[PDB]
Structures are given as C-alpha cells and as structure tokens.
C-alpha cells in the first residue's frame, strides 16, 4: 500500500485568472538502504558519496536541505535547539537567564496583569494552567512534566540516538562525539568543514526513522547541469537519483497574500493531529488564508497502489471573489503611499498626481478593502506590509520566517506582515463613525437643518474638546447644520446631537440622545458582529463598547459621550467591519454578510456557488430614508469638504468621509523592570542607589504586612470556640514568626523601582519616565461608496500614523476609478 498524492486544487480570481497553482521541480533524492549497506567492506560507501554529493551541488550553486542541529557562525559551534529557546524568550521579554519553569510563570504573570487570567488561577495543576494558556492562544515551547523546554528535550533525544547519554554541555565537543560516533564512524583524516557536510546527509537520512520507507529529498529544486552530472556520475553515487516533485506556486507573487495565505510544513505540534486525518509526514498543508480554510477541498482525494492501483482525484478549483485587476491597483497604490512617505516624493495617479510630504516617516503599515454593497462580495483586500506565499512553498520555517516575518513592537498595527490588517487590526474608527452618531440622532427626531453658531470648542471640563481647526488656529465652522457638520467634520456639532444637549449654556435640545443610543446604532450597523470572513480566512473582529458591562460592575460621562460620538474612546473595529457599516448607508440600509470565496469547480467542471447563503438582512431602522441625509453630507465631503483636494475634479460621483484618530498613551513593554533599569541614566539617577532604595521600600512594606498579619492571627486566636485543627494552624504560622513576602512579579518588582526613581529624582513625571515606549499613535482613514446616487462599490482605506488625510484618499480614488472602468 503506497502513498499517491492528489494534485492540489488551483485558487483563481472571480474571472478565472490563476492566483495559486502547481508546478513540477527536479529534486535530488538519496536512498538510505543503498548509500549505507556494506557486504565484505568494513565501511559502507556512505560518507564518501555524502561528501561528493554536497560538493557537486555547492559548485553548481544548488540550494540543499541542511537541518543538522549544530552550526558554525564564526568558528563557534552553536545548537539550533538553544538559539530556538533564547529567540523565544526575546519575543516575550523573559530574561535569557530564566530557566523553563521561571520562563513559564513569567508568561502567566504577564497575562494576569493584562486581565486575561486571575491572580488565583495563577496557581493550579501546571497542566490545567498550560491548558488555560493554550485555549487562550499562547503556546509556550515547554514540557510542564519535567519542567524543561521542548527543544532542550529534543537535544537530549538527539544525543540519545547517536548513543551519547553523557550530557556534559558542549557544541564543538559534542560535534566531535557525533563525528567520531559509533553509528556514523567518519574518517578521522577528514576536515571538520567536510565532516559536517557529510553529517548533513547522514543526519537527514537517520532522522527519517528506522524502516526507511522511501528516499530522502536532499535538494528541492535543481538546474539542468546537476540532473546531468547525477545521472552521468551514477556509478559513484549509488543511492543518489533525480525525481520530479510538484511544488505550490503563486504566479503574481505577493498579490493578495493574506486572503490566499500559504502552504508549508505541518507545525510539529499538530503532525500527530494530521497523521490521524490521513496525511503522509512530508505533506505540505494550508497554514493561513483560503489555502487553510479550504485545505480539505484543495487537498483532493489521494490514491494508492500495491506493487507486491486507484487514481487520485485532484482538488476542486476554488474561485475567490477578488478581481485580479482591481487587487493589483490596491496592492500597488498602498505600496506607493508608504514607499513615497518613506523619505519623501510624489504619488503617481492615472487621475492626476499629488506630491506628499517627507516628514510623514512614522507610517509603516496600511490596509484597504473594496466590497460589492449589494451582496458583500470582497472585490479587493490589501494589507501592507505583506509576504510572498512562494517563500513558504518549499518549507522554510527554520530562519527566513524568523528573519523578516514577525516585526516591531509585538503590537501588530505597525508590525507583523503575516497579519491581515483588513480583518485583524482593530483600530479606533475615527470620524467615519460620525454618520452613525448622526443617523441615531436623526432617528430621535433631529432636523438636518438644525444650525449652531460653532464655538470651535466646548470647555465642559478643566480640559477642552474642540474642532481640529480650533485646536490649531483660533478655529470655527460658523453657521453649522448636519450637512456642514458632516462636510467639514465639526466635532462640536457631533457632541451636541450626541448628548442631545447644548454645552454648557442651555443643556437639552428637542431630542432624546445619549451614548447608549450611539452604541445602539453602532450595533445595528453590525460593528458588534463578525463580517462573514471569519470562517473563510483569519479575522479578529472588534466589539461595540457594552453600556451593560459598565452598570453590572455609573452611566456614561458626558466626555465619554463626546469622544465615543466622533469614533474615539473604546471603539475599535476591523476595516472589514467599517466596510459593512458603510455598505448599509450605500445600499439603502441592508447589512451584507461579506464573502471572499465565490465558487468551486470539480475535475468534472461541476460548479457550486459557495457565497450562496450569505445573509443580506434588512437593518430595522425606524426610517431608512434617514440614510439619504448621511449621503447628502458625505457627497459634500467630496464636492467642497475635507476630501475636495482629491475628489472635486473626478469623473465619478463619490460619497466620502475622512478621519484621523489619536489613541492616547504608550504601548506597554515586554518587561517593565528591564525598561526602567535600561533607562535609569536618562532619569538622572544611579542604578545601584535606585535598586538598593527600591529593595528598602519593599522590605519596609514586608514588615508593615507581617505586623498586621500577626495582629490578625492573634485576634482570630482570641476567638473561643475555634476548633483545635484551626487553632493549631494559626499557632504554627506565628510559632516561628510571620514573614510576609510580595509576589516577586514584574508588575511588583517594577512598581518599587519606579517609586524609588521618583524619590531619588523628586521632579521627574510619570510621562517623562515612560517617554521611550512606542505611542499607540494616530490612524488616518477614508471610507467612500460610488457612484453616490446609485452606489455599487464601498471602499475603506486606513494608514496608521499617516501625516495628512490625503494618504487615505489616494488609494481610495485609484480603486473607485479602476472599478468604474476609467
Ligand atoms: C474625526 O476623526 C475628527 N478627528 C478628531 O476629532 C481627532 N481628535 C484628531 C486626531 C488627530 C489629528 C486631528 C484630530 C475629524 N475629522 C478629521 C478628517 O476628516 O481628516 C479632521 C482632521 C478634520 S478632525
Ligand atoms: Zn465645528
């Protein structure tokens, strides 16, 4: 019974253009049996052929599998195992001199402090506590049982297999054992550079198991020269052969990488899982995006033979909803606005260029989605930075995935390229949320023409709330009704109808409006629900701030109402959510369930519409004609409002709202205590003096708590009728002396170091102490639907930390333009 693998189903675009398909490659395979069987010779020919093969490939410039666990970086021998531990610790802020148990709890402490666990949960059966981490999404490479790192155990089991049960820690000395090994018995005459090159092949073959099912692929892709010299030089290279193997390939490279996703190695965690589902070991699998969601479908139905014969059926071809041609525009447009904002320059546009400032340097990431407002079909979805799915095809999880794929600063809004910002970046909505505020107000009787003489600022607090024009110059909007409000983005107007009062001069207006009702409408526009993509691709949906979860643990502040009413406060939603919200305005008030997987076609050209059952459910508005006001305003934004700069001389009637959201405060560090330490000098304090003092403050608190604990125990002991067993426990506490200890978390250890800094420099502020941390920063937005009077397309474009609002409009214009067939 042999393993005949089915050809992987293709992924195509809406119109049938190949996005992901298969191609054949020449691999160099090596037979274990053949290379290292002997008859009369003491030594097999293995190490002689091994050394010959690598050198051959090396000369010809062929890339070859090298998963031998000891490397040479600068005459220094290092374990891959070990590098893997200390690289894991960096990415969580665990001090590299922490052992596995210490490393483990550090990660628990991390999440308790973060409101993900409780201080009580902190102690449990480690297995139950690991089970709490895993289901919660943190998989930390540690064996709870022996309190040791997986990759350290694997270092044991490797030295066990070459019968080196003596674990004196060594890399170069261990290399020699394995070289001069019983089971490999290399020539002592040879070079140490040559020996490793042999061990590469010898360890490959040895790691694949005892029974040695089939040959072993030593090089996954080779030129015409090698295939000649391996077939030619056949008499030397006994076990060596050429095979043809199919690989996955993405013709258009990184185009739509996140939606498509990628195939790679089974994550070793799950190998067991996949072998129970009937996969072979060498098999590649869907790891992200549609490649993963439709893994079963694309996998096909593989076949078998005996040879002591049934044909495999190929995977169904999966058609996405994306337009290959609209996707290119959106990927290219996002790529431009970041690379031009990098340094400086200008943005080229089929629809008339614009130069952009150089000092917009903080902007690294960006996202954009365009959907069919009638049926939720996702026509283009684009997140930057991104990745070439082709680099995972072969199975490069060792290094190049660790080199460039996870990124700064373990907060993904500016960071990792694997992240699909369109479905996984929760951002502050911005002022797009203003048509949502307005809708609810309109629906509580507001007259669009209600006009106010614009202060530019409310001074309800000691602190001030004001229009952007009033925050820069002494600003004003003057005579403002809803239409001018939406058109120039007046924040005051929005606060006033938000609260349904006038501040602070008259209080109530003719309408019953409040933060709860603003969130009631946010809910109705489906900002509380998953988009529809949740089961097609990786999505991390936002949640509408719960008014109910405030009460059960007073009401909403009338400055929590102000912010919330202009897309600030705890609002935080994916751009794909915002896409549905805007679609509902655009399509007369219908909440469309989004789709990115359109249909599938079998080998036998049978088809099926997958996005067939996608809810298009009518939002129960007290009067959907109200949505016509939101448009009327949104059109003025394009005609003579904030977005006039880009949309005024534009063939298409476009309804747009701009935005920019400032999220307050700093992004917390991996390790607060290390932070304070590494920044002590800049606070004009001495580390030793700071540390010493912090320890004194802790010892001072430990005493204070001991004294009180003592009083408490003595008081319990004064209680007559206190069953003996308890009286004995309370006595056994005291009987030695009570010595209370603070936990020795990072939250605690740091709390004191901070307190000590504040003493030793009595003028320094908290903000000054925290200046070196990353800012959550600003995010600049644009949402639009076209053509305004009979809309077909809704587009949403976010650039976190973009300078002007023009960065958001320019990709939204290119995409609108291209869709409309200009
Ligand atoms: C909506 O997002 C509004 N933005 C704000 O109120 C923020 N407090 C803010 C953050 C960063 C810079 C300035 C203000 C209005 N809409 C914006 C737009 O459409 O571009 C705005 C700049 C007119 S303010
Ligand atoms: Zn105003």
Numbering used by the authors: 50 to 357, 370 to 614, 694 to 962
Article passage:
Cephalosporins are members of the β-lactam family of antibiotics. These drugs achieve their bactericidal potency by irreversibly inhibiting penicillin-binding proteins (PBPs), particularly the transpeptidase (TPase) PBPs that cross-link cell wall peptidoglycan. Four annotated TPase PBPs exist in the genome of C. difficile R20291, a hypervirulent epidemic ribotype 027 strain: PBP1 (CDR20291_0712), PBP2 (CDR20291_0985), PBP3 (CDR20291_1067), and SpoVD (CDR20291_2544).
For the first time, we present its crystal structure with ampicillin at 3.0 Å resolution. One of these α-helices (α13) covalently binds to ampicillin through its catalytic S492. The crystal structure of PBP2 in complex with ampicillin at 3.0 Å resolution reveals three novel structural features. This includes a novel Zn2+-binding motif in the active site (bottom left), a charged, elongated, helix connecting the β3-β4 strands of the TPase domain, termed the “coiled-coil stretch” (bottom right), and five roughly parallel α-helices, the “central helical cluster”. However, the active site opens upon ampicillin binding, causing substrate-recognition residues to translate 1–2 Å outwards and the KTG-bearing β3 sheet to shift downward, rigidify, and displace the water molecule. Interestingly, the putative MreC binding cleft formed at the NTD “hinge” splays at different angles between the ampicillin and unbound structures, exposing a hydrophobic crevasse that is significantly narrower when bound to ampicillin.
